[PDB]
Structures are given as structure tokens and as C-alpha cells.
Subunit: 399 residues, 3 copies
């Protein structure tokens, strides 16, 4: 079930799949090629199944981080956009769609955390983390908090940790150094120290999660929160005058949040590789192409410099892009699973007073390596099953 | 019992040991040294145990791949042949007897897969893989197949995969790079793709094993087969006019099959190191030395350029050598166990449609590292084996955490002649 | 209970804590900071618990090898002694208090195995291992052995193995190369070969442990033994005229024993970092500071060149230092656990003739690599239990 003489596209239901098939019907009208967009349940899990048997869609739209596993399984074809078309998108977006120095997907939309604040309580958002403590008691006098965001998630607290020098793995020359962790450098240390300090001073709770944080802002109890474009819909409903802006700066350095980029990948088994490249290069990745998908459903910031500038008219979108530019592309490697979990524990321990800043991060940097075990002994499952899946000759002869 | 004033030699039962005894008799008459040659059953298993206790033979003749484990266990003495004697053998053979850039055995005989074809059906064997498809339907018109060989074994299908750039591990400056696998490069990809294509087109069965392939050729149903010098005896009995030649070429590159080289190693515990070096350097590794072993039992191609040229008179032997020269020396490292098994699965999966070439190969690559870690599991078991051996042979809180239960590593078959 | 404006010190109950307290009293008098010295049970285990929670002492005195784990856990603050003060101590001691090229403790006292011999039986100790065999039968004629020391421990047999080129891991640039083991080089090979030969010739038992060796010397049955400064007290009681001297030499190279160095580390959580650095730099690490600790309890050889020269008056101490200088600082890395155990087995197997020198030494190097990551994974599995 490849396709052959047609195109089949998989994207997530929560996206502008309607907006896409419009560019499908716009393509179909020019080439005579039937484009079918479809959105199956947990496709990001179906794809490793079906593509492994040569079946599945011709292209797949998903976050760039998941493609790492696909590319390593050889499930994605290597794209060949000329230099001219490369200059049409933001250079940083191309670093998000590259596995082993080989380009393996077209960047679509950019997603990053930003600083959301209530314009009523706060006419001017602080440009620095260091003025939050001073700001908090100014607000606490009126029975309001300065800032509240999710602390149970590293994804949310990483921007501050990594603001001074912290980094997952090292990106140098289109390659991630799995042996060059940076959750233990002086940068991370100071980052987390500041965050712990706020909790020790009573400027923040140690048990602030997502729901608590969101609710606090939406009721107008807090002055600021940190969240992405997905939380915008909820605030509009709260009817609370809010603006999204660039994140504050720590020790004069800007915050470095993670960057989730939607990408279009081409099946390595798809016989219509030329057509996919046709569809995506000249039909979708154009002003009207993105416009159309965007109309059914907003995509936040986009990779395409031309259409981005038009969307930038929205202060919120412009801030998401600016935050992403200064941020860090989320590594698509498998060792990333490890990092997440190691850092998660490190922050929670440092928050609860179960460990100290210096100490909990130094346990994490070691703990990350300790998840080399994951790979080894998860392969111990896939290997022992296969040695015994090839000894199926016990059931071949009985039938 | 090491020896001391004598030379005890071990060699496999199927080899020319009686021919060796002659070279042991001609050595005895010229120095006065009694030379015993014995062929113990499963000696590749006996040697690990006895040489570890300082006992066993002074020298051992076995395939070069097995010596890797021996050398790493410090079981083999480092040889010192001068540059003059080195030039007497083929330079490529010396790369087969080297562990950690130290020479640890003398090369004897070379073994490699070749292209066997029936001269009756096929007067001229194809010089290229790309003409096999065209050839097959030319033969299928007469109710005959063009080619049939073992597909269940990577050993047999590797020559085509590695023909374009595929390689196990990287050999650069007398060192194998365990972190430089090449079963995933563009070379391998195309190699396997072509092989899969033949099976998808109906030019080959997905379940062709060794017995099926051999039988098909020996009955004269197939035009060609790929096999080594060990299968020659069987074809002579079939009485079917056959010639062995260089393997075909893929994308203009020649096939790169594995090369099994018989070698003479010297026990690190043998006090008669000087005598062994004497025996092998000036007595065995000579025209008349090899001749003698060869007479009791053919050794195929030999390392010695002088005697090789005389044996080359046989078209079959000359082809084995030529195939070996263009081939790849089989790495004697432990990570090789892993490779084999990873590639075996990859080919079989690609052969059925259960995975694609791109998919199965990139899989097997990840899986190769996956084993060079359960290699630890063995020492981890042998860490606890000797720990509980000595802690028997005499006369709370976070303790629960400990969980060293899984897993098991199930062994393989032997394989598999006659 | 961090502290703040006070100084709490931890040191081993067996060491001269009272001497340290004197130094505390002197600090208090000259500043206004009360210094408390306490020696709790199994403190080197307590510390990892309490320091992980930000609690515990401001400084900790323990062997330098244990600090490796502490430093890696980020439990120790990085010290900043100027170059002037660095020149006051022996340069080799500074290589013992360094984790990842960052200095993390002040060296205090140096400990190393030496050659102890009975002056009555042996007026002059042999300067070379190669003359031991000849010496042994000279002594066996009078019903006495030439040498007896612990063979069950690599710690004791390593000086001879490593004397020709053997080495745990490679120290180059202030960094340990975990991939550059040296228990398999020609140096180690010959080392162990000689040791095995002595046992095969009947110059030594394969089952000589610590107790047996010590007793043999103390009764005056053996002419020589190899042991550290901790065994001195026992010999004095034996009342047997003994002298401690530099270890013999193998193939012209000197023996390379391990060097255990007592160090003062500062808690990374201590708010009185400045005061600790004050206490240790200008109060304890001085002639009168060490003197005082030394009086309650001897510390053997000291890092401080000035006070060392004054203690050198004791032939025994001078020999410990000289043995340490030619020896090998014991690596404080985690892969060290592996080495120990790998070598232990290697020696014992080579002792029994269960393996050859070549074979057993090859096994242990490949063994050290196996149990080294699997002590890293036996913790990875272990932590997933504690975190679910
Ligand atoms: Ca173009
Ligand atoms: Ca950057
Ligand atoms: Ca010569
Ligand atoms: Ca080659
Ligand atoms: Ca003062
Ligand atoms: Ca100074
Ligand atoms: Ca004085
Ligand atoms: Ca000196
Ligand atoms: Ca030295
Ligand atoms: Zn859906
Ligand atoms: Zn404050
Ligand atoms: Zn428009
Ligand atoms: Zn036999
Ligand atoms: Zn065809
Ligand atoms: Zn002849
Ligand atoms: Zn006590
Ligand atoms: Zn004398
Ligand atoms: Zn003797």
C-alpha cells in the first residue's frame, strides 16, 4: 500500500488537514494527481509499523523530534532542495530537519514558549529575570503574584537553566555530541540556583503544575505565566487583556527555550518521491499554500520568511518567532529520552530541598549516561524476540 | 604437561595431518626432535582450557578468526619473521594474522567463495551480476535456472552486499574500528536491493538453503552456484563438467567475499618457541613442506607465492586465490559474533518483504552495537562464576533494589558439510 | 543545619582530632568564629547522605580516594590556593586532590608501604628484589625466611607488578584515561612473573595473608615484611629491633606502591567557604598547626615541605615519604573499584598456577572493562527502582 501515480499525506487531526487538502485539490487541478490527506489515530505510532513494511503515506507531517527515530530506521527519504529554496526559509529551521548531516524533511511551522502577561496588572513586562523578586512583593501588596508557571516540567524550566550556558548535547557542524552534556556547567548551576531561590523566598510554590499555573493566570490572580501558542485559545475565553512577549533575560543572556518544528517528511518507500518534492517545494511552501492551511487552523510562526513577515503583524506570533530564534532546537536523538527524565528529577529534587543545586545537576549529568542502559536492554527485548521469531519453524511444519 | 625438548602439534581431523607428520619426520631426522601431531576432537574448545593452565600443544593450526579470542586471552606468542620471509608470502595474508598490530601466527592456506558453473549449460560464465536476470529467462526457456546459492547465510550473500562499499568494521593501519560499521552505507543498500530484486522477479527462491542449492547444481538443474573449495568433492561425484571462476561484478566493482585463512600459532606457554619458529619458518613453509601436507589432503590456495604459482596450474585454485585477493579478510574480533547475527536477520527480513532494504539494514546496524554490550554480560557472568567458585571451595533498606536477573544468550548450530 | 558564621569540622575518631581542636581554639581566639570538631561513626558514609541535602560539616578530612565520588556528586567546593601556597606543599600531593583538572581539597598527610626488616637478622636490607632468592636460602640455613608479606591483596603486591611499567590508568595532563589500562604491558608481566617464581621456588607461600605475615615478622621468624605506618605500633610491642627503608628495586626500576593521602575538603553547601579557606590555609597547614595534630596522634609523612623536613629526623617517616615520591597516587575514579577486583583475581590465579602470567593478566584488563560499566549499569537499573 505505497500508492503509485498518486499522493497520500498524513497529518494530525488537530491541524489544518482541511486547509491542506485545498492545496491538494489545487495541486490535483494542475498535474492530474489525486492527493488524499488523512489523519489516523496515533499515526506517529502507526508510521513506524506500516512504513517498515513498505506501506503507509507518501508524506508525513509531525514534530521534527519524532523524525529522529524514523530517519535512523531508514524510514525517510533524503530531500534535495537547491540552495535557492533553502534561502527561502529561516536558516535555523534547516538545522531541525537534519539527521547525520543529511536533510530529511521540510520545515513547516515553529513553536516555542513565550512570556504571557496581563496588560491590566502589568503595563510593561520585565525584560529581566532579576527584577521579578522586586516585582513580586510590589504585586503581593495587592494580593497578586508576579509569575506562575509549570515547575513539574523541565520543558518549562529549561529556558532559565539553559539561559547562561546550559545545553542538552552539543550541536557542532550538523552533528550532536552525545558525550558533551551541559546540565552541569556553571551556566546551568546559576540558572537553577536562581529558580530555587525564588521558591525559597516565597515568590513561587514548589508544587505549581500546568493546571494550577494556567488557572491562576486566567482568573487574573498572577501577573505573568510562561506558555506556548496552544494556551492562547484558553486566555481569549478568560477575557483578560493579555500580550505575549520575548522571555526575560538572565545575567544579561536571553532565555533559551526548546523549539518544536512541524516538518514534512517523505516515505523512503514512496515511489512518488518526485511528486512529493513537487507538491511541497512549489505548492505548499508558498504564501498561498501556508495561508490555506493557516485559515482552517493557525500554525503560529512559520518557517517561510516571506509569509512569516505577513503573519508577524500579530504581536504574539512575532514573539514566538523571536523566542525561537534565541532558543534551542530540541535534539531529535534517542539519548534525549534520557536527558528529559534526568533533568526532571534534578529540578524536582532541587525544588523540594531533597538535594542542592550543585548536587542535583551533577547527579543528572551522570544519570543521563546511565540511560545508555535503556538502549542496550531495550535491544535485549527486540533481539531475544527475533532469535525466537526466526525459530518459528516450530509452527511452520505443524501447519 | 607443556612439552619441553619436543614439539606437540594440534590440527583439525579433516586436514592433511598425515602429510604434516612427514614434515615432522623430516624435522626429526635433521635436528633429532620427535614431533608429535595429534588431531583432538573439538580442539578449538580444548585449547582455551588447556593453554589457560599452561598446558596444551606447542603449536596450533586453525582458521585465523578463532585466534582473535586466543590472542586476547594472551594464549599466543608473538612471532618475529624477518622482512625477507614476510615477502615470501602474500602481503594480504599477513593482515589476517595480526592482533593489535602484533603478528601472532603464520599464514598457511587461503579459502574463499567462488563462482561454480556447469560448462555444459554455460560455456561462458557471466562476468557481471547485472546480466543474470537476462540470463535466467534464457535458461528458464529450457527449464533451467541461472543461479542458485544459499540465501539463509550472510556468509554467502555478503559478497554481493559488500561489493559496492559494504564492510563489517573498518581496517585502517593494522586496527579494526569497532565504531565504523558499514552495513548501512549506500554500497550495502544497493547490494541488497539488487539481491532482493532477483527474488521479487522470480529469479530466486527466498528459502534456498545450502542443501537445496547444492542439490540443484549437482543434478544439473541450475546453471550456476556460489560455493567454496569444500564442495568440490561432491561435484566430482555428480560427474558434471564444471569450472570454478572469479565472482561476477556489481556496478563495475568486484564481489568481496570473506577470506578464511588457516594459520599456525605458537602457544605463549611453550618453552620451545625457538624450535617452533624453526619448524615453521624453514621446514613447513617451503615448497616441499606444503607439498607434503597437500598430498595427504589438498589445502586449496596457499600463502606461499612460490608454491601457489605451481598449484595455480589448477584453474579452480587460481580462482579461489583471485577471489580472495579481491575479497575481505574476515575480522577476528569479538564484535564479529554480533555482526553475523545482525546481518543474518537483516537479509532474511529483506528477503520476505517483512522489512525493506533501507529499514532492515539500518536495523541490523543498530543491532550490531546492541550485541557488543551483551559481550559484557558474558564476562559479567564469568565475574560472578569465579566469585562464587572461590567463595564455595573452602572449609536491608536499599538492598532490595538489586535486580541482575535477565537475560540469556542462546548458542548457534555448527554447520554442516557432506 | 548548614551553620553560617560558625565552623564545623569532621575528622576520623582514630586520627588526632584533639590536635585539630587546638587549632580551632586558636582560630576562634584570632577571629570570633567558634570551631567545632566532631568524629561521628562511619562519617565517610554519613557525608554523602547529609551533604546531598545541603547539611553536614563545613570541612571533611578523609583519604583522597573517597573524594572522587564526592567531587563527582558536586559535594565539594573548588579551592583557590595561590601559586605561593602551592609551592609550600609537595607538587606530587596536588595531583592527588584534583578532579577533572579542578583542585578540590588540601593535602594533609602521605601514606605508603615501605620495607620493614629486622636489624638483628639483617643489618643491611637488600636494595634489589633480584637478590631475595639468594638471600632466602642464606636465611633458611638458620631456619628463618627472607621475606613475608600479604599476597592475598593486590595493594601489597602491586608495588612489584607496577615496578617495571605497570599502571592502573594513565595520568596525563591532570586527567585519568579510563581506556589506557596497564595491567597487561610487558612491565606488569615481568613483575608478576618474578613474584610467581618466588612462590614456585619455595621462597614464599601462596596463602600468606596479613595476619600470618605480621605474626611471622613480630615473632622474628622472617627477616623482612612489607607494610605501612599503621603496623608500626605492633612491632614496637614485639620489642624487635626494626628499621623501615625504601622498597627494593626490580630490573633497576624502583617499586611503585599506592599513595593514600589525607585531605581537607570543603562542603559545596557550606556558606563559610571563606573561613574554611582561612582556617586551613593559614592556621592548620603550618608548622605549629600540623605539630599540634601530630602530638595527639602521629600522621606519618606530611604534605608540608617545611614540617616534613623536621619530621624526617625519624628514619621511618623519611622512608615513607621517599617510597611515596617514587610510588603512584591511587586514582580516585569509580573505575578503580573494578581494577582492584580484577587484579585481585589475577594475582590469586597466577599464584595457584590456575592460569599463566600472560593469561591471567589479559583476563583482568578485559575484566576491569566489563565490571567497570556494569557497576555503572548495576546503578542505572538500581535508580529506576528508587524512581518509580
Ligand atoms: Ca529551484
Ligand atoms: Ca544558539
Ligand atoms: Ca632469515
Ligand atoms: Ca578491502
Ligand atoms: Ca585574620
Ligand atoms: Ca600565598
Ligand atoms: Ca614552635
Ligand atoms: Ca626525597
Ligand atoms: Ca610518577
Ligand atoms: Zn484524526
Ligand atoms: Zn526577595
Ligand atoms: Zn494573500
Ligand atoms: Zn581424530
Ligand atoms: Zn527481471
Ligand atoms: Zn616439487
Ligand atoms: Zn567517635
Ligand atoms: Zn649476609
Ligand atoms: Zn631459587
Amino acid at each position: 500500500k505505497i500508492e503509485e501515480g498518486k499522493l497520500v499525506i498524513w497529518i494530525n487531526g488537530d491541524k489544518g488537514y482541511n486547509g491542506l487538502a485545498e492545496v491538494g485539490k489545487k495541486f490535483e487541478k494542475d498535474t492530474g494527481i489525486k492527493v488524499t490527506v488523512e489523519h489516523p489515530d496515533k499515526l506517529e505510532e502507526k508510521f513506524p509499523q506500516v512504513a517498515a513494511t513498505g506501506d503507509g503515506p507518501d508524506i508525513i507531517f509531525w514534530a521534527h523530534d519524532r523524525f529522529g527515530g524514523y530517519a535512523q530506521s531508514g524510514l525517510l527519504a533524503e530531500i534535495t532542495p537547491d540552495k535557492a529554496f533553502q534561502d527561502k526559509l529561516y536558516p535555523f529551521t534547516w538545522d531541525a530537519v537534519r539527521y547525520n548531516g543529511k536533510l530529511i524533511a521540510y520545515p513547516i511551522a515553529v513553536e516555542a514558549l513565550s512570556l504571557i502577561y496581563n496588560k491590566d496588572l502589568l503595563p510593561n513586562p520585565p525584560k529581566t529575570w532579576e527584577e521579578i523578586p522586586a516585582l513580586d512583593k510590589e504585586l503581593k501588596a495587592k494580593g497578586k503574584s508576579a509569575l506562575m508557571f509549570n515547575l513539574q516540567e523541565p520543558y518549562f524550566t529549561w529556558p532559565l537553566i539553559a539561559a547562561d550556558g546550559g545545553y542538552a548535547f552539543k550541536y557542532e557542524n550538523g552533528k550532536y555530541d552525545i558525550k558533551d552534556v551541559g546540565v552541569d556547567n556553571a551556566g546551568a548551576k546559576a540558572g537553577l540556583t536562581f529558580l530555587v531561590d525564588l521558591i525559597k523566598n516565597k515568590h513561587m510554590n514548589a508544587d505549581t503544575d500546568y493546571s494550577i499555573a494556567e488557572a491562576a493566570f486566567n482568573k487574573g490572580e498572577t501577573a505573568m505565566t510562561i506558555n506556548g501558542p496552544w494556551a492562547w485559545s484558553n486566555i481569549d475565553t478568560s477575557k483578560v487583556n493579555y500580550g505575549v512577549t520575548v522571555l526575560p533575560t538572565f545575567k544579561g543572556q536571553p532565555s533559551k527555550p526548546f523549539v518544536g518544528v512541524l516538518s514534512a517528511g517523505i516515505n523512503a518507500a514512496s515511489p512518488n518521491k518526485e511528486l512529493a518534492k513537487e507538491f511541497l517545494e512549489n505548492y505548499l511552501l508558498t504564501d498561498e499554500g501556508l495561508e490555506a492551511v493557516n485559515k482552517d487552523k493557525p500554525l503560529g510562526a512559520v518557517a517561510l520568511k516571506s509569509y512569516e513577515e505577513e503573519l508577524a503583524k500579530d504581536p504574539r506570533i512575532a514573539a514566538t518567532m523571536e523566542n525561537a530564534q534565541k532558543g534551542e532546537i530540541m535534539p531529535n536523538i534517542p539519548q534525549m529520552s534520557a536527558f528529559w527524565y534526568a533533568v526532571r528529577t534534578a529540578v524536582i529534587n532541587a525544588a523540594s530541598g531533597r538535594q542542592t543545586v550543585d548536587a542535583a545537576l551533577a547527579a543528572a549529568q551522570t544519570n543521563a549516561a546511565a540511560m545508555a542502559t535503556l538502549e542496550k536492554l531495550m535491544k535485549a527485548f527486540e533481539s531475544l524476540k527475533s532469535f525466537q521469531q526466526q525459530q518459528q519453524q516450530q509452527q511452520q511444519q505443524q501447519q
